[PDB]
């Protein structure tokens, strides 16, 4: 029925405490944002 709700911080997962790495991640656009919203989805419809 329910799956273990997992939220993954692609900002720190990809770039842990790095500013230049964070800028490089931002250069890719919003991919981190799509990942975050997809996981928040998984969580919300799992709760539903």
């Amino acid at each position: 029925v329910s799956m273990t709700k997992t939220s993954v911080d692609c900002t720190m997962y990809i770039c842990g405490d790095s500013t230049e790495c964070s800028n490089l991640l931002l250069q890719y656009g919003s991919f981190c944002t799509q990942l975050n919203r997809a996981l928040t989805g998984i969580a919300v419809e799992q709760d539903k």
Binding site: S7, D9, M12, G16
Partner: protein, 38 residues
């Protein structure tokens, strides 16, 4: 001597807010972490 290393940034942060037309008051939530900074 043997020392342990633990990465920082425990958990995340969430925002609890009512409707924009209701009020400006907010409540913050720190996931899977005890109240340390406050």
């Amino acid at each position: 001597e043997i020392l342990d290393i633990t990465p920082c940034s425990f958990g995340g942060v969430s925002v609890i807010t009512p409707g924009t037309n209701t009020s400006n008051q907010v409540a913050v939530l720190y996931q899977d972490v005890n109240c340390t900074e406050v």
